[PDB]
A paper describes a structure:
Previous studies showed that proper introduction of disulfide bonds could stabilize the flexible region of target proteins and reduce the conformational entropy by locking the protein into single desired conformation. Here we developed a comprehensive disulfide bond prediction algorithm that not just increased the success rate of predictions but also improved the quality of crystallized target proteins. We applied our method on two proteins which were previously determined to high resolution and frequently used as fusion partners for GPCR crystallization, cytochrome b562 (BRIL) and Flavodoxin, and verified our prediction by solving the crystal structures of the wild type (WT) proteins and mutants. The theoretical and experimental results both indicated that with relatively lower values of conformational entropy, proteins would be more stable and readily crystallized to higher diffraction resolution.
The continued disulfide omitted electron densities of the side chains suggested that the disulfide bonds are successfully formed in all crystallized mutants, which are T9C-A36C, A20C-Q25C, V16C-A29C, and K27C-A79C in BRIL and N14C-C93, A43C-L74C, and C102-R125C in Flavodoxin, respectively. In contrast, the other disulfide bond (A20C-Q25C) locates at the edges of helices I and II. On the other hand, the V16C-A29C and A20C-Q25C in BRIL, the N14C-C93 and A43C-L74C in Flavodoxin have higher entropy than that of WT counterparts, consistent with their relatively lower diffraction resolutions. For BRIL proteins, the simulation B-factors are consistent with the experimental values. Furthermore, our results indicate that the conformational entropy and protein stability are sensitive to the location of the engineered disulfide bonds.
Author numbering: 0 to 106
Amino acid sequence: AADLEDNWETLNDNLKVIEKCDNAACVKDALTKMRAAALDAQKATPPKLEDKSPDSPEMKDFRHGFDILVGQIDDALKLANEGKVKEAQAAAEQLKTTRNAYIQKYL
């Protein structure tokens, strides 16, 4: 689905931005766009799960992954708002493990 692809690309491009950021505002802005992308992608049905039921275990698993991902973005956003550039970057790298094991397999 087009919207879902754009939100997923926004999530992954803005991860790259975070690692090469030099200040806190850079990190916070990237996390801002990841959060708004994750809020939309959270609601979508990935194409591999189009036929599934919305209460299927795969859709439950897809939605729980984005709950974790949104929780992780919020943790990193808390660190960026305190000025802790490096800790916010370390908290951003945590998203990669959730992305692979939970969400990427369904896209």
